Design a protein around this ligand. Sequence first.
Ligand SMILES: NC(=O)c1cccc2[nH]ccc12
Ligand SMILES: NC(=O)c1cccc2[nH]ccc12
Lengths: 265, 265
Amino acid sequence: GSLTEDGLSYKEKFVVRSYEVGSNKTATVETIANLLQEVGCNHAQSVGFSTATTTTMRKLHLIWVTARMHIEIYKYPAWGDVVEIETWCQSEGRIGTRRDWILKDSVTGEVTGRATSKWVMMNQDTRRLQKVSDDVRDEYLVFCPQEPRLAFPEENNRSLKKIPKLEDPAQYSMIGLKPRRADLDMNQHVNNVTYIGWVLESIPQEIVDTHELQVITLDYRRECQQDDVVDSLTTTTSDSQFLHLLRLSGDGQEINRGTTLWRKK
Amino acid sequence: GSLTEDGLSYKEKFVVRSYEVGSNKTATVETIANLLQEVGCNHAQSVGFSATTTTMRKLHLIWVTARMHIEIYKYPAWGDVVEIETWCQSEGRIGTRRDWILKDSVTGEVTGRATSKWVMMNQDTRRLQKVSDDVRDEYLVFCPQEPRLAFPEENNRSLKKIPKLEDPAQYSMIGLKPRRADLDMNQHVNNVTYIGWVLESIPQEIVDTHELQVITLDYRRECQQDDVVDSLTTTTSNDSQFLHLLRLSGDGQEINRGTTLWRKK
Ligand SMILES: NC(=O)c1cccc2[nH]ccc12
Ligand SMILES: NC(=O)c1cccc2[nH]ccc12
């Protein structure tokens, strides 16, 4: 992969692996989300970030936390196909940063998907959110385009829609979900993609067999720790549309909420 | 990737991804095992398979893994390129064997080696059978005629018989269940998932002070999508050695047994 000519975005190509595809022999949405995070890490590495915080974030013990992921897929890449992903970052005042991605077919150059993510700043020890510092923002404004470049430019698009809280009784549920070592990142935290897989565990088999996942929006509220247990709840709100809630198995503390949209095959 | 000059083996290079590494910022053994299966799949694709022969598909016959043995000297770091060469060899009517050699792309030094034993099974009845003459003759043209073993040693660890763990186990991880991410494109649990499940019962203290050097896993029965697994581990020993048993919750039907060897960091 490499930074583009103007140094303000990054591109990388991936060959879809055999173990990265589902029953329809095209890449799963968890494989897509892993590729989004991988090209995001290579972008930060290419501009000098920690091997992904700045000089001042490191001394203040500040980190980036994902607040929201929104993915829209038109065509999932087949096993053996090459998918090219371009990513870039943009600041959003003191509220946080945004990282967008565009997925393309390498042969046709056609856009097969797009994604947007909202990141917030948090003290790694206290887990307290704190907006963005005056001279912390100055350290990374040089690696972001100055004019707005949005993957979802539409006014009032699906990526910014507020998600309600699912009320019991849920229509479908998958309970007692627990992470294993494969689910941890290099910092021993549960990987953000694991939450996507957990949301989708409560989608009935019949839906997965007759429909294709087109849109997923996931809010991140609290992390599931290595010794926590998760319940995945899903209710139909309708194409097929669903409301989702991940909560810790005991007290019922919310960790995530989201919606999915599905097209009939 | 590509077949080598003589067409009797296959080589492929992989850049280690950010989400593929553990706390030591080097690739996990599950990432290694996924790469072994990926280069295995590209080798079969390059020789005309899709991965059974013309007679196997007609007779509803498939390849099933009976044993995996991996030995790692140095795990590839995040961002490093690892080159893997793989080949197959027939072992008479018992079945076939696929071996792999892992190398550092920059230094050319061997950083690991693996061997696997495969058997033939009727996909519907789940009944094992010896390889027939007409099925064997179909793939003998893609295997070297002289023996080429990743583990040539007089009495190497790859062929050692593994005993059955007796209760009470020293360590256990109970109620392990697969999710959709764990399934392959045929809706069967991925062979690498069993490795992760064996390692769930290794105490945290071991993982922090030791490095996994050797893993041998026998495969006996599959865990189905609605099955629940218990992972049991007992110390059998500078080095640390363990005996492992995976069994279904309830009746306690064995699905796997194995051993691991660990060196102090
Ligand atoms: N990945 C990051 O930490 C990041 C944050 C803000 C702007 C950026 N531009 C390239 C990478 C990056
Ligand atoms: N992977 C396979 O299906 C296979 C089986 C037997 C011999 C082989 N030689 C290359 C690939 C291969």
